[PDB]
Design brief:
alpha+beta; RNA Cap, Translation Initiation Factor Eif4e; about 180 residues; cytoplasm
Length: about 180
């Protein structure tokens, strides 16, 4: 009946799923496919300023698992930004909105994002596919900086390098 007609949800291009790792143990917690479901879920998950130390909160396209070994992610990598502890809520929200709104020019390459809550600095990363496509990666990085008003350099780390070297993995690209 007209009830659904006059209050119709606004579908997203993709479905997305939040995953959480507490402080193989990464679990899916909320899926959403519309703008209204996004805000409903976002308003019931803690913002990073109220997540516990060592928490990782991921938002990935439906059916991409946030693991280096996932076949979509395997040859990919990540861009990373840093924020002071407890000062990452706005950057997280903008990152989410840019992703789910398909605002990136090379938005095909995006897998998802994650916020890592740590003492000292919080980190946010966008995970992408096809690490070796430097042009596409640089487009994403540059465009992300512009969305955030971020004024520092940001680096891209191949998943292959993060797996092999650990803390010691270096940035392949910077922008």
């Amino acid at each position: 009946n007209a009830a659904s007609l006059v209050h119709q949800p606004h579908p997203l291009e993709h479905s997305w799923t939040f995953w959480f790792d507490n402080p193989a143990s990464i679990r899916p917690i909320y899926t959403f496919s519309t703008v209204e479901e996004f805000w409903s879920v976002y308003n019931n998950i803690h913002h990073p300023s109220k997540l516990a130390m060592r928490a990782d909160l991921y938002c990935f396209k439906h059916k991409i698992e946030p693991k280096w070994e996932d076949p979509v992610c395997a040859n990919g990598g990540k861009w990373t930004v840093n924020f002071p502890r407890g000062k990452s809520d706005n950057g997280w929200l903008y990152t989410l909105l840019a992703m789910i709104g398909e605002q990136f020019d090379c938005g095909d390459e995006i897998c998802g994002a994650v916020v890592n809550v740590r003492s000292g600095q919080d980190k946010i990363s966008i995970w992408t596919k096809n690490a070796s496509n430097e042009a596409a990666q640089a487009s994403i990085g540059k465009q992300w900086k512009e969305f955030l008003d971020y004024n520092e350099s940001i680096g891209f780390i191949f998943h292959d390098d993060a797996k092999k070297f650990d803390r010691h993995a270096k940035n392949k690209y910077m922008v």
